[PDB]
Amino acid sequence: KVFERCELARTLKRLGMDGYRGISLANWMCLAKWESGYNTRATNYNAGDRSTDYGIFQINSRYWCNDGKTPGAVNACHLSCSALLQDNIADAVACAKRVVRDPQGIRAWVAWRNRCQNRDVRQYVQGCGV
Numbered sequence: 001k002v003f004e005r006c007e008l009a010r011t012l013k014r015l016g017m018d019g020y021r022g023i024s025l026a027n028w029m030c031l032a033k034w035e036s037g038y039n040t041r042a043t044n045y046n047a048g049d050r051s052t053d054y055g056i057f058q059i060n061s062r063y064w065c066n067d068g069k070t071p072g073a074v075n076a077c078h079l080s081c082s083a084l085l086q087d088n089i090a091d092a093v094a095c096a097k098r099v100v101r102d103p104q105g106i107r108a109w110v111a112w113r114n115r116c117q118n119r120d121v122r123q124y125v126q127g128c129g130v
């Protein structure tokens with residue numbers, strides 16, 4: 001599914017993401033916006049290393065989920081990458097929380113650095129009641 005902006009904001013808040021490991025909801029929203037356009041079924045194949053990015057947060061199969069077809073991969077979220085393509089984002093949120101429990105935090109998503117870091121991200125939660 002493609003979330004509407006404020007629908008996603010409230011969904012993420014109910015799943016405990018506001019301030020998780022210090023990350024504001026608006027940062028999670030900025031991440032989802034620029035990774036997938038709020039699209040839970042999005043996939044991106046990376047021909048350079050044979051990995052695939054999955055779901056609304058475009059979490060990568062080399063380290064975080066298992067899709068069986070990524071060489072030399074691990075599965076730190078202990079999920080099938082299929083779980084990151086559901087309309088219900090609970091599993092994707094659990095995996096995103098696992099990602100940011102590692103040292104880089106939200107910087108683990110390279111695109112967050114380019115699109116959200118040191119930027120005014122509040123527009124993404126304006127009017128959503130969060």
Ligand SMILES: CC(=O)N[C@@H]1[C@@H](O)[C@H](O)[C@@H](CO)O[C@@H]1O
Nearest residue numbers: 046058059060099108109110111
């Ligand atoms: C949290 C996450 O999945 N980050 C992955 C990162 O590890 C990978 O090296 C980059 C390259 O495509 O994609 C994403 O940023």
